[PDB]
Enzyme design. Structure first.
Site, short mmCIF file in Angstrom:
data_model
loop_
_atom_site.label_atom_id
_atom_site.label_comp_id
_atom_site.label_asym_id
_atom_site.label_seq_id
_atom_site.Cartn_x
_atom_site.Cartn_y
_atom_site.Cartn_z
CB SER A 234 -1.01 0.01 1.12
OG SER A 234 -2.09 0.89 0.83
N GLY A 235 1.86 1.29 0.79
CA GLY A 235 2.64 2.56 0.84
C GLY A 235 3.90 2.59 0.03
CB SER B 88 -3.56 4.26 -1.16
OG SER B 88 -2.79 3.05 -1.21
CB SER B 89 -3.45 2.40 -6.35
OG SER B 89 -3.66 2.90 -7.67
CB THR C 202 0.03 5.34 -8.35
OG1 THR C 202 -0.48 4.69 -7.21
CG2 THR C 202 -1.07 5.57 -9.40
N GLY D 73 0.71 -6.58 -3.99
CA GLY D 73 1.45 -7.75 -3.72
C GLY D 73 0.95 -8.38 -2.50
CG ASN E 205 0.30 6.81 -0.81
OD1 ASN E 205 0.61 7.94 -0.51
ND2 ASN E 205 0.52 6.27 -2.00
CD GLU F 128 -0.01 -5.05 1.92
OE1 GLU F 128 -0.82 -4.55 1.01
OE2 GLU F 128 0.41 -4.44 2.90
#
Length: 840
Positions: free
Chosen positions: A178-179, A240-241, A183, A463, A237, A465
């Protein structure tokens, strides 16, 4: 130094000064004592071996600490020659620690790009860098990754190259938590393509450049729309995407841009209705209520205070690093460029507000009845109007859902709790669809007539997680990744095997993918998880519990990757664990059945289907066309084209993808996140360690080390070592990029065993480099011992020239004294003495 100019300003963040290097590689080192070691608090810290307990080890620390740890809690440390290695896979010490440590060191030095085999590791700077520098872009243009330092444009250019050179399509797989900041990269890669191979000729002029009306722009403009709708402030983030994506940049024949293609995967539908406390929903909402375009507010019939829309203010409303006002336009403008009709551009907005309103829709229990009855027609009115609906018809359908059990249509009554939940289901449903549509529409503009010969796929997804809590969504993602991984392991197997074929080494080995097939089959195969999952979804009276049992009765004890959970640790409940490449994931099966059914009140959908708002009408069509197929109670939705599984597509899409990925030359990029705390130049250990395992990085190192750890790419081999037999190694490297390295190794008092060549690279042992040195060691005794001698010789040779000179000056002194000793007692001489003065 000489080379670096192109970057110049970026240089320091790409490469280090030629002495910084030199001062680092050429320093004292004690192999037998220097080591890496386990550590209860900090993951692995470095130290010096003190003693040896026969199978225990006592070590000092770097901070000052002494620990007696097992023999295998102890790991060697690379000679200084490998300080901040561009390619860790060239190291002669393929460990867990050495990898962590290399990344870390070149980060504290502000180098974010380090390679680990094929990968292109990337670490979040958390600050600004001249790397994306418009000078660099050129610099990396036309350069193999051995001609330049570790960087993403390397990957990105090579792709291009390779694209035209081999006449094959390419891909870039970006992945991280996530972080990690993917993107950002993705985008950045994209610009890269657009720049280095554009030329719309007419569109290039400084006249509303990049506005709607050109792609290179459209291409670009795409992002900022999707981002308003599929992005949000995560606790990690700020942008975040919340979805995955795959773009196909269709290059032409010449090599100039021709088309693009987006595809979206797994959107976080839940944000639309929920939000964690430190998070927030999609931007759009906050964008819109920002008030930069006041009409909008009145147009949508909302306020500017988000606390009026429960759905979107459960968490946070404002983020300091984001200017909702600026974005609103960005967004706005993008829509236009994207070619959307005002109307559509109106639907989008109007539709995005309806959804807010829904969450405001309130209900109450009918008296003496357990039925839901509308608690007012204030909001419904707005939602109704905004969607091109009728308030009433709407509230009915909602309250008195008219179903079709048997061969007819049976009117069913709902509860308060049932409504609130159904509403939410549409809110989400609608948003999604829309989002999907937007993408399609984008794609539509991004469609040109010009011929296409190849494309370059850029895949951005999450990915693997692991959470203490793993639900359905996790499985879907993990599954995606476990596939992606195998995809690599194979490419590597294929790749490896070419070298040993090119060189002539004799190494046999089985596909590395194979190791994972076990897990994959269990998920995707017929009597596997998904199936059992998607079958039960057909049973009108099945339970999560039901499903569960079916899962076991069939896989438990019979399947190895299948296991019953470990309920305790940081985990929250029990159902089933799986054994993925990254590790064991404990999955909770609760809601699955539902989530997987995508239950939607069909009466309402009906209304949508006949809206005055075409767009809204459109979005629903595909539901309206499969109803034929699931006419009566029970049965199969697919008969009419309706989804039977929440998972039925995901798979279909994931297949269409992994297939597109195959007719591609895979190019890998692994994004990393240093510290949860957001601090540049820092790194938590175990946090990075994690990523590394789930990344594939640690698995690529494994496969490498099977064996012959460090593996040098040929050019990367030339440059760095030509100098060793300079004449004959340079000739070799220049004369045949590969044949060279071959030829080079001709010289040296080195073990011609310890290595092995192959199609793309040489393979080398460690304890190899260890072997090398040794030979080297002897070679200096030679060199030194001989250089000492002459010196020694020469040293005394000057002594003779002095001894000799001295020869007489002594005598003079010698005799001269003696005189005096004799004389000084002589009358005549004393006389002369007292008298010697009166003279002149």
């Amino acid at each position: 130094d000489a080379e670096m100019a192109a970057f110049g300003e970026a240089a320091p963040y790409l490469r280090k000064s030629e002495k910084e290097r030199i001062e680092a590689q050429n320093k004292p080192f004690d192999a037998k004592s220097s080591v890496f070691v386990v550590h209860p608090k900090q993951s692995f810290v470095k130290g010096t071996i003190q003693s040896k307990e026969g199978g225990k080890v006592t070590v000092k620390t770097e901070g000052g600490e002494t620990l007696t740890v097992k023999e295998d809690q102890v790991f060697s440390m690379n000679p200084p020659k490998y300080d901040k290695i561009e390619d860790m896979a060239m190291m002669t010490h393929l460990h867990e620690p050495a990898v962590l440590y290399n990344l870390k060191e070149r980060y504290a030095a502000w180098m974010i790009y380090t390679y680990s085999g094929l990968f292109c590791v990337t670490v979040n700077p958390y600050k600004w860098l001249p790397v994306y520098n418009p000078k660099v872009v050129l610099a990396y243009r036309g350069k193999k990754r051995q001609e330049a330092p570790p960087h993403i444009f390397s990957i990105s250019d090579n792709a291009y190259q390779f694209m035209l050179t081999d006449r094959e399509n390419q891909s870039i797989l970006i992945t991280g938590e996530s972080g990690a900041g993917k993107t950002v990269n993705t985008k950045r890669v994209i610009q890269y393509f657009a720049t280095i191979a554009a030329s719309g000729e007419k569109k290039k002029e400084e006249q509303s450049g990049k506005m709607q009306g050109t792609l290179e722009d459209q291409i670009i403009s795409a992002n900022p729309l999707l981002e308003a709708f599929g992005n949000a402030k995560t606790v990690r983030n700020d942008n975040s995407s919340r979805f995955g994506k795959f773009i196909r940049i269709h290059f032409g024949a010449t090599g100039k841009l021709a088309s693009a293609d987006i595809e979206t995967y797994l959107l976080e539908k839940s944000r639309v209705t929920f939000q964690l406390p430190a998070e927030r929903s999609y931007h759009i909402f906050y964008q819109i209520m920002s008030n930069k375009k006041p009409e909008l507010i009145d147009m949508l019939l909302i306020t500017t205070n988000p606390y009026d829309y429960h759905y979107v203010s459960e968490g946070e409303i404002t983020v300091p690093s984001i200017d909702d006002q600026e974005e609103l336009m960005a967004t706005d403008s993008a829509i236009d460029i994207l070619g959307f009709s005002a109307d559509e551009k109106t639907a989008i907005y109007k539709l995005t507000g309806a959804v807010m309103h829904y969450g405001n829709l309130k209900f109450k229990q009918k008296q003496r009845e357990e039925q839901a009855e509308p608690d007012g027609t204030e909001v419904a009115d707005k939602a109704a109007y905004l969607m091109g609906l009728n308030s009433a018809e709407l509230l009915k359908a909602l309250c008195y859902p008219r179903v079709g059990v048997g061969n007819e249509a049976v009117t069913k009554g709902e509860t308060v709790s049932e409504v609130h939940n159904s509403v939410g289901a549409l809110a989400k449903a609608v948003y999604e669809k829309m989002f999907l549509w937007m993408v399609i529409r984008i794609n539509q503009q991004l469609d040109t007539k010009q011929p296409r010969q190849y494309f370059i796929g850029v895949l951005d997804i999450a990915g693997f997680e692991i959470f203490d809590f793993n639900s359905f969504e996790q499985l879907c993602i993990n599954f995606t990744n476990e596939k992606l991984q195998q995809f690599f392991n194979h490419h590597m197997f294929v790749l490896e095997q070419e070298e040993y074929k090119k060189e002539g080494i004799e190494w046999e080995f089985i596909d590395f993918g194979m190791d994972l097939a076990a897990c994959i089959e269990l998920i995707e195969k017929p009597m596997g998880i998904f199936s059992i999952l998607e079958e039960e979804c057909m049973f009108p009276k099945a339970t999560d519990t039901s499903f569960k049992n079916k899962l076991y009765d069939e896989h438990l004890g019979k399947s190895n990757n299948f296991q019953k959970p470990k309920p305790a640790k940081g985990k929250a409940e029990a159902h089933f664990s799986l054994v993925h490449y990254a590790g064991t994931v404990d999955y909770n099966i609760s809601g699955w059945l539902e989530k997987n059914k995508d239950p939607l009140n069909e009466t309402v959908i009906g209304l949508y289907q006949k809206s005055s708002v075409k767009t809204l009408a459109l979005l629903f069509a595909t539901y309206g066309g499969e109803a034929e197929g699931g006419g009566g109670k029970k049965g199969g939705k697919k008969k009419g084209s309706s989804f039977q599984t929440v998972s039925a597509l995901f798979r279909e899409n994931l297949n269409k993808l992994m297939a597109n990925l195959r007719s591609t030359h895979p190019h890998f990029v692994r994004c990393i996140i240093p510290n949860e705390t957001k601090t540049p130049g820092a790194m938590e250990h175990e946090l990075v360690l994690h990523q590394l395992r789930c990344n594939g990085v640690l698995e690529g190192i494994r496969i490498c080390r099977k064996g012959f750890p460090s593996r040098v790419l040929y050019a990367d081999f030339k440059q760095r070592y030509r100098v060793l037999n300079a004449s004959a190694i340079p000739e070799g490297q220049f004369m045949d990029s590969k044949k060279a390295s071959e030829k080079l190794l001709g010289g040296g008092d080195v073990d011609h065993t310890q290595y092995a060549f192959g199609h793309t690279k040489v393979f080398f042992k460690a304890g190899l480099l260890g072997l090398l040195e040794e030979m080297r060691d002897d070679k200096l005794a030679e060199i030194i011992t001989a250089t000492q001698a002459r010196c020694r010789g020469f040293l005394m040779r000057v002594e003779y020239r002095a001894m000799v000179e001295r020869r007489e000056s002594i005598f003079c002194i010698q005799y001269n004294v003696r005189s005096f000793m004799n004389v000084k007692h002589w009358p005549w001489m004393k006389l002369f003495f007292k008298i010697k003065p009166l003279l002149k």
